[PDB]
Design a protein around this ligand. Sequence first.
Ligand SMILES: NC(=O)c1ccc[n+]([C@@H]2O[C@H](COP(=O)([O-])OP(=O)(O)OC[C@H]3O[C@@H](n4cnc5c(N)ncnc54)[C@H](OP(=O)(O)O)[C@@H]3O)[C@@H](O)[C@H]2O)c1
Ligand SMILES: NC(=O)c1ccc[n+]([C@@H]2O[C@H](COP(=O)([O-])OP(=O)(O)OC[C@H]3O[C@@H](n4cnc5c(N)ncnc54)[C@H](OP(=O)(O)O)[C@@H]3O)[C@@H](O)[C@H]2O)c1
Ligand SMILES: NC(=O)c1ccc[n+]([C@@H]2O[C@H](COP(=O)([O-])OP(=O)(O)OC[C@H]3O[C@@H](n4cnc5c(N)ncnc54)[C@H](OP(=O)(O)O)[C@@H]3O)[C@@H](O)[C@H]2O)c1
Ligand SMILES: NC(=O)c1ccc[n+]([C@@H]2O[C@H](COP(=O)([O-])OP(=O)(O)OC[C@H]3O[C@@H](n4cnc5c(N)ncnc54)[C@H](OP(=O)(O)O)[C@@H]3O)[C@@H](O)[C@H]2O)c1
Ligand SMILES: C=CCc1ccc(Oc2ccccc2)c(O)c1
Ligand SMILES: C=CCc1ccc(Oc2ccccc2)c(O)c1
Ligand SMILES: C=CCc1ccc(Oc2ccccc2)c(O)c1
Ligand SMILES: C=CCc1ccc(Oc2ccccc2)c(O)c1
Ligand SMILES: N[C@@H](CCC(=O)O)C(=O)O
Ligand SMILES: N[C@@H](CCC(=O)O)C(=O)O
Ligand SMILES: N[C@@H](CCC(=O)O)C(=O)O
Ligand SMILES: N[C@@H](CCC(=O)O)C(=O)O
Lengths: 255, 254, 254, 255
Amino acid sequence: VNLENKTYVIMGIANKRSIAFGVAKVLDQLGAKLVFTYRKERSRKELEKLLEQLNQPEAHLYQIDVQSDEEVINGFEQIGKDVGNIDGVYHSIAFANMEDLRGRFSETSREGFLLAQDISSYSLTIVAHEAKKLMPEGGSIVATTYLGGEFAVQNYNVMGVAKASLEANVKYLALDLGPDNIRVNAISAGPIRTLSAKGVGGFNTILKEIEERAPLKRNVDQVEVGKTAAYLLSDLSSGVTGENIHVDSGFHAIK
Amino acid sequence: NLENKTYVIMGIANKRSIAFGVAKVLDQLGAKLVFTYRKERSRKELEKLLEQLNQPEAHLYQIDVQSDEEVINGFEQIGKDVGNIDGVYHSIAFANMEDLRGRFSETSREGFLLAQDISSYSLTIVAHEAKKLMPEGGSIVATTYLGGEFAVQNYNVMGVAKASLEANVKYLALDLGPDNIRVNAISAGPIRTLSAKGVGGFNTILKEIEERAPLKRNVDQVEVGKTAAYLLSDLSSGVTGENIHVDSGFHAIK
Amino acid sequence: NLENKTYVIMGIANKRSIAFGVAKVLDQLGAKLVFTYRKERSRKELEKLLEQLNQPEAHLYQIDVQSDEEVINGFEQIGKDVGNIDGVYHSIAFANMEDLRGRFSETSREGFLLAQDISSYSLTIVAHEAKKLMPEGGSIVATTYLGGEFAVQNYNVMGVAKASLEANVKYLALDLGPDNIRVNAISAGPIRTLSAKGVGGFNTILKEIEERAPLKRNVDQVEVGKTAAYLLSDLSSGVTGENIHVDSGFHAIK
Amino acid sequence: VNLENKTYVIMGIANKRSIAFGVAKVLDQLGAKLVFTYRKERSRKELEKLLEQLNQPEAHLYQIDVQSDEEVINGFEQIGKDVGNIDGVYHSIAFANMEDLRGRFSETSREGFLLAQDISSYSLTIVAHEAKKLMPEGGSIVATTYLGGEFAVQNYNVMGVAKASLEANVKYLALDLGPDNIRVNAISAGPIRTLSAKGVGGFNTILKEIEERAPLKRNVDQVEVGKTAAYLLSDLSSGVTGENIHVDSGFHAIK
Ligand SMILES: NC(=O)c1ccc[n+]([C@@H]2O[C@H](COP(=O)([O-])OP(=O)(O)OC[C@H]3O[C@@H](n4cnc5c(N)ncnc54)[C@H](OP(=O)(O)O)[C@@H]3O)[C@@H](O)[C@H]2O)c1
Ligand SMILES: NC(=O)c1ccc[n+]([C@@H]2O[C@H](COP(=O)([O-])OP(=O)(O)OC[C@H]3O[C@@H](n4cnc5c(N)ncnc54)[C@H](OP(=O)(O)O)[C@@H]3O)[C@@H](O)[C@H]2O)c1
Ligand SMILES: NC(=O)c1ccc[n+]([C@@H]2O[C@H](COP(=O)([O-])OP(=O)(O)OC[C@H]3O[C@@H](n4cnc5c(N)ncnc54)[C@H](OP(=O)(O)O)[C@@H]3O)[C@@H](O)[C@H]2O)c1
Ligand SMILES: NC(=O)c1ccc[n+]([C@@H]2O[C@H](COP(=O)([O-])OP(=O)(O)OC[C@H]3O[C@@H](n4cnc5c(N)ncnc54)[C@H](OP(=O)(O)O)[C@@H]3O)[C@@H](O)[C@H]2O)c1
Ligand SMILES: C=CCc1ccc(Oc2ccccc2)c(O)c1
Ligand SMILES: C=CCc1ccc(Oc2ccccc2)c(O)c1
Ligand SMILES: C=CCc1ccc(Oc2ccccc2)c(O)c1
Ligand SMILES: C=CCc1ccc(Oc2ccccc2)c(O)c1
Ligand SMILES: N[C@@H](CCC(=O)O)C(=O)O
Ligand SMILES: N[C@@H](CCC(=O)O)C(=O)O
Ligand SMILES: N[C@@H](CCC(=O)O)C(=O)O
Ligand SMILES: N[C@@H](CCC(=O)O)C(=O)O
């Protein structure tokens, strides 16, 4: 898995704990050139501090709020103009309101339901469409999902239906972009303490149950997600598309 | 036997509607039926289709599931007109036609969100409001297609709306189970309907079923209805969060 | 209503057997029932349990599904005694005690193969022999457990037999589909039975259902039997190669 | 991925077209020590001739018929004495009579049904048990499966039920061996012209459906399976266990 002369766009770093920063460290250690997108200026500030730990000689940073068609379209356009064609995209982006991540799913508001779909699922579709322009010879797109997309997990509520939606998006993108030699896959990460995890009720309980019940008896971390991202984004996974790899200590496989 | 049961059926548009299939079966079983429709078309249409049924009266309510207020006032009214209900059959979905062909990667934000709104979110607010009419418990069934589980050619934005609906069912099963409300899905095989006309290559889809599915025949709306009757009754008391394929066994082969 | 239908129920040992839940329901719905058994002790219990049913006749056949001869000759006798049948409920599994606890990696070859033979192969041969008595189609249902789909502590060799059983249902559905013979499974939640005493930590499993499953209660044998009635009847005519969870929604959560 | 100082056992090479030989070539490229097990004398012969294509400085060949406990037990024990501890096992073994394979599935004989389970599924359990003794600090076990284990595929018949058994075996082994840090996983390969494929009815029409329908619109090869094996057998896939990775051009994702 040597990645020199490969370029990947990593979307969704907010701070040192981000799953996307685990990917960035692994890709960067494997010699890839990296392009980062962020939403909040605070995330750019963190990226600028975090880039100090990476071997990248150039900070390539773009503000892309995936709610904006304009900003995805012009951001990727700009990316191509600055770094030329790319090899793949790591999508690590999701959002829901706090109100909708605890108590009763049946009480989800329409606006909070469509908000989570728009940011956490649709964003992959329009990103794939725009990123495909920069991959005339093929490439690899990987999104980050959670087991809550496949089963009802307590408290995960609106996010789970948005992850179900994301995991299908991956399948439909895989079929549609296959003839272009663009692979599309998801990683299903086990619970990891991030800024977003703070919004999920019951999160400490979830971690504990993994240590008690998952086959490896331990939690996974961000670098483990990254190592599997390196596989998915690289030629090691030629042949693999429409797939969902659980990086979760085995927990998906047990009841 | 469904005498003294009452079910709300959402999404009859014409004689070919899957929901009319459900209707004829529940009616044949002695249930009292309430209907909800979106446009006045499906109303005059329902007025005439209701003459086939043995319903001694016409409980019709206009509900566009795109409006919270309509879903709310609608179910409140049903509650005043008929009292507590035993279940809801959801048979409602939509996507713009240009989204149901060519390249899924070219889907608009607006069309993606519209399909989610009508085809998946609708079940959540329907269930919240229907719950109010089921203090003793009850049964909610939605209609999905195999396209929510696998990428199918042309089905596109609706495949992601279905994947969403299927998890919606799971999360509603978990939330509503302590209230004794079961929530399930029927994954219907391909049936020629009004909406079925809007999917690219629907005929190639019907023919594949005959050639390849275990029963080597297509299903009809009555078979969906027979399985709705099971899920909506005490025959399925132990069963919730489930997805039952009424598709001649297509789901189980490759 | 199942009057003028005939079903063979395989695997009643006592009043707690899942298959006796199936028998009660089907008997209540007016079916003629034929029973098969392995141990003497099980025929005795069967004779006693019949007094609670409305069967005018005791139709009882010893069939140890480890023997081809017994299955072939059992089904042939059944056809001579009662004629053509409408389906078969299979409620048979076995593994050695030390293979339902501890470490799966230490399973013996003879134990693994024993569990496959009785718990999965037996369906294939029963289907072949039963097909002969279903010239116009019918319905076959096997009983499975979520441990065939996931690794469950202590279920061990039986988990692998159930995974084999669940595929056997799909391959049989595809094979026998063109003969209008449907094949399905019910994945039952945990229920206190004689066999359940072989599974390490059973009580803990039961408590986990009550605490975590959507319905927050365990299921019983009659709930299994109600879903069997649906699968074994024309209500489910469109449905084959399917696995219906009767487990209070436990399969749908994590 | 770099695999110097790692040792793997590869079971089930018969000739140049065997899936397991694609595994061998990839791992050998990555610097692994490889140890090879075979059943038929003809397979040891092909092995000896195929070894010349490889960088292995040393033939390590062991006859093991997985029908025999003794041969599995003694085989792994001798491997231990010859090479030391190992880092994992690639399992590429299956078998079923022609005479059951070209029946209506409902006509499968008891002895052929159990033969296929014995060789194609049970053998993994016993291999894992014996190989565990050579993995005190952990390691990784990979087995080869096919989509016909998850769905009823025309003609695949008794082997579909065996693959279903194998895929559960993987899960139960993952759970049992997890606390010892041994990961167990499966690769679900797409159709590949092998000696074994020559017993599946209508193999050619299966091949061509892939090209017409699979998102990548093309068939896979042995080397693509090997690259995914290298991933599964290496530290890249820490956190992954009880997983089934489809290497099949995305075919598993479509209907
Ligand atoms: N932590 C876990 O246990 C876990 C497990 C499985 C899956 N996941 C998934 O992992 C992914 C990354 O999350 P994380 O856990 O690493 O948390 P995180 O560090 O908070 O990252 C989430 C990212 O989403 C971005 N984002 C939200 N809305 C956006 C928008 N409109 N446009 C652009 N970016 C937007 C955030 O950017 P800003 O902060 O700049 O707004 C942030 O960088 C998510 O898809 C999540 O669902 C997490
Ligand atoms: N036909 C198939 O092969 C098939 C297979 C699997 C699943 N399904 C599912 O079955 C369900 C019914 O489809 P069908 O084939 O029976 O087509 P149909 O007869 O055209 O029914 C579609 C129904 O959805 C209603 N609807 C659309 N948007 C609505 C809205 N905003 N508010 C309220 N109602 C709305 C339509 O109402 P108006 O016309 O009054 O607007 C119509 O009654 C859908 O969920 C569909 O996805 C169909
Ligand atoms: N109870 C549960 O929680 C549970 C949950 C899910 C699925 N299941 C499945 O339900 C089915 C039976 O369940 P149960 O729990 O009801 O146990 P049960 O009352 O102990 O019945 C098991 C039956 O299997 C029969 N059997 C064993 N070996 C046989 C053989 N070689 N030939 C013919 N019959 C044989 C036994 O007959 P004899 O006594 O005459 O030997 C007995 O009637 C099994 O398939 C089991 O795996 C059980
Ligand atoms: N080819 C495909 O399209 C395909 C697709 C998906 C999965 N698979 C799986 O891939 C694996 C490898 O098969 P293949 O296609 O590569 O065919 P293959 O080249 O014929 O290899 C099959 C191997 O199985 C070995 N084997 C059979 N019985 C054995 C026993 N009792 N003890 C030890 N080894 C035994 C054979 O060894 P001997 O020749 O020495 O008897 C042979 O080396 C199998 O598990 C197969 O089911 C194949
Ligand atoms: C709840 C267990 C694992 C987990 C933790 C954090 C996650 O990230 C988000 C959760 C909710 C909204 C936005 C992001 C997430 O998607 C999954
Ligand atoms: C592809 C064939 C099966 C099929 C036919 C009709 C269906 O109903 C709709 C299809 C597209 C938009 C709205 C509803 C539907 O969801 C599935
Ligand atoms: C593990 C809890 C559910 C459960 C309980 C009992 C079961 O029946 C048998 C269990 C082991 C051997 C034979 C039958 C069974 O298959 C499943
Ligand atoms: C059916 C298409 C793919 C395929 C081909 C060859 C396979 O290997 C064997 C198939 C049958 C018996 C032994 C091995 C195999 O397991 C799968
Ligand atoms: N139950 C507390 C703690 C949850 C957590 O661990 O994040 C909450 O709802 O915030
Ligand atoms: N832990 C108990 C469980 C037995 C049971 O409940 O079946 C034991 O091993 O006996
Ligand atoms: N036992 C049912 C089978 C139903 C079916 O084959 O559709 C019958 O009476 O035929
Ligand atoms: N269908 C042909 C070809 C089989 C094959 O390609 O393996 C046959 O029955 O042998």
